[PDB]
Amino acid sequence: VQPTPADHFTFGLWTVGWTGADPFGVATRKNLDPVEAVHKLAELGAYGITFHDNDLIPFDATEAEREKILGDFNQALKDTGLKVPMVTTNLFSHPVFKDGGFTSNDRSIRRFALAKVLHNIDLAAEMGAETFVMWGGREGSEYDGSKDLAAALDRMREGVDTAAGYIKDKGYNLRIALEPKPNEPRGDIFLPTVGHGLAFIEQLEHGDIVGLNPETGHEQMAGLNFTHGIAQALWAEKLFHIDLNGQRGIKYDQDLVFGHGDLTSAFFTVDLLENGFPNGGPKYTGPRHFDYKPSRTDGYDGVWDSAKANMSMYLLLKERALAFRADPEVQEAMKTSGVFELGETTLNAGESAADLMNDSASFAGFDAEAAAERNFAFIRLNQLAIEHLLGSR
Amino acid sequence: VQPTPADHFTFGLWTVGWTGADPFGVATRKNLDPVEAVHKLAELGAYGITFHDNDLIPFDATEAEREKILGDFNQALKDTGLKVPMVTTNLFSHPVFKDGGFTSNDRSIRRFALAKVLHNIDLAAEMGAETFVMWGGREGSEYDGSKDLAAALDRMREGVDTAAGYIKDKGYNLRIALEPKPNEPRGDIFLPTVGHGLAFIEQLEHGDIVGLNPETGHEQMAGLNFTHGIAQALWAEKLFHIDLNGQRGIKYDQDLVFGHGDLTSAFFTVDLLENGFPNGGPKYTGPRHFDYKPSRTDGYDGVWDSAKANMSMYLLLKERALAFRADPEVQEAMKTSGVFELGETTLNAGESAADLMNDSASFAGFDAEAAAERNFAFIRLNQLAIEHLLGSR
Amino acid sequence: VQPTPADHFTFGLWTVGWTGADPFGVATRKNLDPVEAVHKLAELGAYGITFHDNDLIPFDATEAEREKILGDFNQALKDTGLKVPMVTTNLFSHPVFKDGGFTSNDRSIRRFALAKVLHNIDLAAEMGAETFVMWGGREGSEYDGSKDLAAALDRMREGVDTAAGYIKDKGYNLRIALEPKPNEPRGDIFLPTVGHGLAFIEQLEHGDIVGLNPETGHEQMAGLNFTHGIAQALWAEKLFHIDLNGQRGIKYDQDLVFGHGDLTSAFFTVDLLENGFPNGGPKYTGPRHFDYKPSRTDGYDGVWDSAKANMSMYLLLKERALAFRADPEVQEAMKTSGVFELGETTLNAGESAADLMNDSASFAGFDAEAAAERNFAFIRLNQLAIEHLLGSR
Amino acid sequence: VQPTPADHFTFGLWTVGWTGADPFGVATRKNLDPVEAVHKLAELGAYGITFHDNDLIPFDATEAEREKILGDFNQALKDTGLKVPMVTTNLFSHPVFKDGGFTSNDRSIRRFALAKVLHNIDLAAEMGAETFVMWGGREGSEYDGSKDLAAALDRMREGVDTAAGYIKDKGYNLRIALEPKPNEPRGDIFLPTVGHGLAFIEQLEHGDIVGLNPETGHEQMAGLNFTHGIAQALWAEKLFHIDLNGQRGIKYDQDLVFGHGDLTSAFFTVDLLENGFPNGGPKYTGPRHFDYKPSRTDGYDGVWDSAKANMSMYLLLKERALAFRADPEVQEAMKTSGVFELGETTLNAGESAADLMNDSASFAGFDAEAAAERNFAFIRLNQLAIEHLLGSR
Ligand SMILES: OC[C@@H]1N[C@H](CO)[C@@H](O)[C@@H]1O
Ligand SMILES: OC[C@@H]1N[C@H](CO)[C@@H](O)[C@@H]1O
Ligand SMILES: OC[C@@H]1N[C@H](CO)[C@@H](O)[C@@H]1O
Ligand SMILES: OC[C@@H]1N[C@H](CO)[C@@H](O)[C@@H]1O
Ligand SMILES: [Mn+2]
Ligand SMILES: [Mn+2]
Ligand SMILES: [Mn+2]
Ligand SMILES: [Mn+2]
Ligand SMILES: [Mn+2]
Ligand SMILES: [Mn+2]
Ligand SMILES: [Mn+2]
Ligand SMILES: [Mn+2]
C-alpha cells in the first residue's frame, strides 16, 4: 500500500506541526516550518494541506510579514503540486476567545470574531479551497447558568448566516462545514454531535451551503457510533468533509492516527466511504483528511512515520473492505440477514395507511409468533466481516 | 410542597406498575391493576396518566376482553378526573420486534409494526390524548454490518410519514413526538440523541406535526447536558413532551426518580421549564411527565412513596429556581457575566458583512489584549445558583 | 484454525443456554437442555463446561429431582469426556437477593446466601472443579445512604472468609475467584474493578486461596484497559480464572463474542495470555473461559455459530500475536522503544538511595534537555502490531 | 459559615496559581507570586498550603536562587502561621518525563526521576510536611505494545520502595500517598483507580508507610462512586490524604470547585469525612485539601471567589449532613432499611460454617418467598437525604 495523489489524502498543518504541549507539560518538539511540512507531505504521497489562519500567519503579523509568509507558502505549493482543499479559523487560542468567538457574552468580542472569519473567507477563496470549516471550540460553558441558551443559538446562527451570506455576495465557490465536539475545552460545547449540527443547519437562512465536518474521535467522546453518525450526514446530503483519527474511549480528545483507536469501527467507516450503502444512495467524494497529533513521546522520525501510518491504515482497510463486499459468501450472508430486504418500501405502490390497517395479512391474521422465528444470523455476518478485516479470508 | 392537578404531573402506567424484572432477575412485585394505579395516582395529586397499548390491552386479548378493559379504565378516569395526555405503542417486547418494528430487516414485520401503530393512533384519538410518542427501542444494531443505514432511515421516515399522513387524513388533534435513546436494548439505537431526532424530523414530508420527547437519563447516557439538549429543542420549537427522571452516569438506563440523579442539572432543567430563557423565547407548556421505575428493592409502600418523591423533588426545585431568579444579587451577577449582553445582535441594524469587515474598531484597531481582560465571573454566578439550591439564601 | 481440547476452551451453560429475555422483552429462543449443551460443545472442540447451581438445579427442586438431573448430567460428561473446571452460585436471580446475598441489609438473607454458597462448594468439590467463582451482582446500591460502607465490606469479608475456611477445613482442592463489575444490576456494585477486588483480597484471613476472575467487558464498562488490569492480577499472582467476551463502549453489559468488541485490545489480551511478558515473568495457565451471550436476533444456528466464533477469534488472534512477536523487525522496533530496557533495575546492584542521590551523573550533572530528545518510536511499534493483526505482514 | 484554621482547609499553590493555559490556548491570567498566595490564603481562613517542588523552585534555579525563594516563602509562613502539610514532586512537566518518571522506558530518566524524588523528600521533611504525595501522571501509555506491563510495575515498586526505605533510614516523620488517575495525560495511566493503588501498596516492601491520595474527579472519570472508593481506602486504613474538587461526567479532568460537580455525591463524601460510619468504625482525620482550577474565563477576583467557594461548599454541606443524621425521622428511616442490621455479624458467636449449613432455619426450611417481601424503603431514605440537602427539613 503506496499512497498516490489520486487517493486524496489531506493533512492539516497543525497535525504534523503539533509541538507536544498538553495540559500537564510543555512542547517536546521544535516548531515545524510550513515550507518543510509541504515538501515532506508531498514526498509522502499527500494530495493536499489544510490550515487554520494562525497556523500560517501569526496573530500579530505585520502586513510585510503576512505577504512574505504567503509568498513562501504559495512557492512551496507551486513547487510540489499540493492543493489546499480546506481552510479554517482559530477562534480558540488567544485569551480574547476564553468564552467563545461567535457566542461570547461580550458583544465586542463576537464582532471581532466574525470579522476574523470574514477576512479568513477571502484568504480561503484566494487559496482555491472548496471548503471552509468552523469548529466552535470555546462556544459553550462549564456551568449551566453562564448562558442564555436560546440567545447562544441566535448568536451562533447570526455568525454562520453572515458568513454564508457574504460567500454568496462575493460569488466564491465555497461551502461551510461545521465540526461538532461534545466537550473540551469547554465542559459542554454547543452542537455537541453530528445530530445537533444537522438540526442547527436547518434553522439557517443560508443552510443550502452549510454542512458537516464530523471527526471520528469526537463522536466516540459521547460513546456514539461514528459510522452511524456519518451515515445520517450522508443520507441528509450534508457530509461536506471529514476528519479521520482514532480514540480509545470516553476521555480527552486523543487524536490518534486513523485506525489506532476503534479498529472494527474504522473498518466499517472505510467500507461506507469506499463502497457506499449496500442498496445504493449518496457517496462521499471529498478529501480523506487526517486531524491527528503525533504522540508527544515520538521525535521527528516518528512525526513522518505517523503521517504515513494514517495513509497505510486507510489503504489496508480499503483493500479488506473491497474484498469483504466482493466475497460471494458475504453477499449470501447479507441476503439471509435481510440487508437487501431493508431496501424495499414497507408499503406497496399506491397502498395507503387505511389500506394497510384493514389488510388482514399484515395485522388481523398476521402470525407474529411464526414471524419471530426468523434467524437473522447477524453474528455470522459480523464474524465474516472480522475474518476479512484480519485478512484470514 | 403539595401537588395539585394544576401542576400537570403525569405518570406512565408502566412506571408505578414496574414489576422489578431486570436482566439478572425476576419480578419482585405483583402486577398492578390499572384501575388501582388510576385511583392511587388520583389520590396523590397526579393530573393524568399515560400508557403503551400493551400496558393496558394484552397482545393476545380477544375483542370482548379489549372492551371490558377499556370500560374499566374509562370508568376509573371518569370517577377520578384523570386526563390521558399521551399514548404510546410497544414495539419492543414481543419476540417479533427483535430487530425492530419500523426498521426491521423483515418487510412483513415492518408492515405489522406500522399497522399496530395506526390502530394505536385511533385509540389515542378516542382517549383524548394530545401527544403520540414513538420510542424506537429495537431500531438499531449490535454489529455495523447488520444494516444498510440509508435504507434504515428511509424505512424510519416511511413509517413516521405514514402515521403523520394518517393523522391529518383523519383530522385528529394529535402531534407525534420521538424519543431518542443512544443504546439499550440495542448496542446502537438510531436517532440516539435530541440532536439526531431534530435532524431527522426536517427530512419528513409531515414534519410540521412531528417533534421531540427527550428523556433526562437518555441524554446523560451519552454524557450530554440535558438542559442544553432541551434548550435546542425549545429554540427549534420541537419540545412536544418530556420524560423527567434521574441517571447517575454513563451506564444502563436507571430511570430513577426525578432529582435522584444529577441534582444541579435537575435544578437548571426546572429553571428552564418554569422561568424560560433569561432574554425571553419559547416556553414549554406541556405535561411534566415522569418516566421512572420504583427501585426493585422497595415494596408497595415504596411504590407510592417514589411516585410522590417525583412531585416533591419538582416542587422543591421550582421553589428554589423561582427564588434564584428573583434575587437582586443573582440579577446583578447575571448582568456582570454578560447573560443579558448575549441577547443583543452582533451586527448593528442594517450593518452588512462588508460594513463589519472594514469597521476598524471591530477588527483592524480592536484591542484584543484589553478585551481579554474581562472577568466573566462565571464561578461566582454558579456559587450563587448552588446557594439557592441548598436553600442557604 | 480448528480448536481441540488442549486449547482449554470452556463455556458456561448460561451462555449458549441464554434465551434472550432482556429488560425490554421476553425470550426469543426455547430453553436448551443441559445434556444437549454438553454433547454440542464437546462436538465443537470444547474442553469443559461451567455452570451456576440454578443453571442445572432449579431453586425449587426436591432432593429426588436434584439427583435425577445430576445423574443425566454426569452421564453426558462421561460420554463426552468434558471436564467441569469451574462452578458458581446464583446469588442474584431470586427476589430474596434484591439487596444482595452476602451484603444484604437483612441478616436472615445474609445467612441464607452463605448457606447456599456452602452447599455449592460441596457440589463443586464433587464435580472436580478447581475454581469456585463468586460474582457479587446484587452487592451494592442505587443511593449512597442505603448502606454503611465499612459494615458492607466486613460482611463481604465474613462471607468470603467463611467460604475459604470451609474449603481448608474439608481439604477440598479448590480456589475462590471474585468477579468484579462496576454496575448493573446495582447502580454501584462493591469491588467494582480488578484493582478493588485485588485490594479486598489482601484484607482477608484466608486470602491465600482467593484470587480474581476478570471479565473483559466489565473493566471496559469503567473505561479501563483490560490488558493492564489482567497484567496487575498476574503480577500479583491472583489471576485464577478469566471470562473473555466483547463490549463496545461504556454502556450496559453486552457480553458479545470475544473479538467482537475492542479488537485491538482483544489482540493484546491474547498476546499476554499466550505469550506472557517480553522480559519474561508470570504466565496464566488456566482455562480460556468464554462468558458471552448469543445476540437475541439470531436462532439456534446463530447460538452454535457464536460458540465456534469465540474459539476461531481466539485462534486467529493467537496466530497473529505469534507472528508479531517472532518478527525480527518487531523485535528491533521493541529494542528501539526501550521495551527490554524497562526490564533493567533502576538502581545498580548494591547502590543505595543515598548513593543515587549524590551520583552527579544521575542528577546534578544530568542533561535532561539531551535525554528528552529520544525518539521512543511508539507510533511505529503500534503500526507494526496493527499490520500483523490485519495479516498484512 | 466562615472557615477557620481548625477546619483544616489546605490548598495547593498550583490551584490558585493556575494561569489558564489549556491544550487549546494560552494563559488568561498573570503569574501569581507565592508570597502573595500565602498572605491571601491565610486572610481567607486556610490552614495550610501545599506545593510541587517546581511550583516554588524552577527546574533551572541555581542553589543561590533556591535559597532566596525558600527564605521569602518561609518568612510568609512565619508571618501568617500557615503550615505546609503536604509536599509533592513534578514528574510530568519537563519534556524528559514524556514516557514517565519511575516507569520511563529509558533507564537514565528513571534514575533522574528517583533522584528528583529523593531530594524532594529532604525538602518535605525540612518544611514540616506529614505527607509526601506521588501522582504518576506520565506513567502509562497510548498503545498496548509500548510497555512490558510486569516490568512497569516492578520499576514502579522499585521507585516507591526506595523512596519509603530512605524516609525510614533518615527517620523522617513522613508518609507516602499515591494519587490514582485513569487517564490524561497518558491514554492509560498505571494504578488508574483507588482499588489498583490499594492493591499495589500490598506488594511493597515498605507498604506500612504508603497509603492513598484519592481525588474526587479522578474516580468519577472511570464512572466510579467516590464515597464507595474512599470508604474502602478508610476501611483498609490507607486514606492518608485527599483531594476534593468537582467533575461533571466522564471527560477531561475538570478540577472544578468542590460541590460544582456531582452535588449529591459531594454531600455523602462530606458525611463520610465528617460523620464517619453509621455503625461506627474508622474516621479520616487529615487535611481537607482542595485540588482545583479556577475557570480560565474569570479573573483574579474569580480566583479568590473560587478559593472561598471551596470552603463555603464544604461548610454548607457539613451543616446539612449533621442535620440529616441528627434527624429522628432519618434515624427511624435508617432502622427500617436495615442500615444498623448490616452491622451485625452474619454468624452467631461461636457458630461454624458446618453449624450454619445444617441449621434448617437458615437454609432448608427458610422461606425465601416470605423474606423477599421486605420493603427496604431505600427510595424513601434517599428522599430524606435530598430534602436535608435542599435545606427543606
Ligand atoms: O479539520 C478541521 C479542524 N480540526 C480542528 C480541531 O478538531 C478544528 O479547528 C477544525 O475543525
Ligand atoms: O413516555 C414515553 C415512553 N417511555 C418509554 C421508555 O423510555 C417509551 O416506550 C416511550 O417513549
Ligand atoms: O464465569 C463466571 C460467572 N459469570 C457470571 C457473569 O458475570 C458470574 O455470575 C460468574 O462470575
Ligand atoms: O494534591 C495532590 C497533587 N495533585 C496533583 C494533581 O492531581 C498531583 O500531582 C498531586 O498528587
Ligand atoms: Mn480531535
Ligand atoms: Mn478536527
Ligand atoms: Mn429510560
Ligand atoms: Mn421515556
Ligand atoms: Mn458481563
Ligand atoms: Mn462473568
Ligand atoms: Mn484532577
Ligand atoms: Mn490531585
Helices, strands, pairings?
The structure is a homotetramer of 393-residue chains.
Chain A: E1 9-12, H1 13-16, H2 34-44, E2 48-52, H3 53-56, H4 63-80, E3 86-88, H5 107-127, E4 131-135, E5 140-141, H6 149-170, E6 175-179, E7 188-189, H7 194-201, E8 210-212, H8 216-220, H9 226-235, E9 243-244, H10 263-275, E10 288-290, H11 300-326, H12 328-336, H13 353-358, H14 368-371, H15 378-389
Parallel strand pairs in A: 1-2, 1-10, 2-3, 3-4, 4-6, 6-8, 9-10
Antiparallel strand pairs in A: 5-7
The complex binds 2,5-dideoxy-2,5-imino-D-glucitol (4 copies) and manganese (II) ion (8 copies).
InterPro entries (chains A, B, C, D): Xyl_isomerase-like_sf (IPR036237), Xyl_isomerase-like_TIM-brl (IPR013022), XylA_actinobac (IPR013453), Xylose_isomerase (IPR001998)
EC number (chains A, B, C, D): 5.3.1.5
Binding site for Mg(2+) 1 (chains A, B, C, D): 179, 215, 243, 291
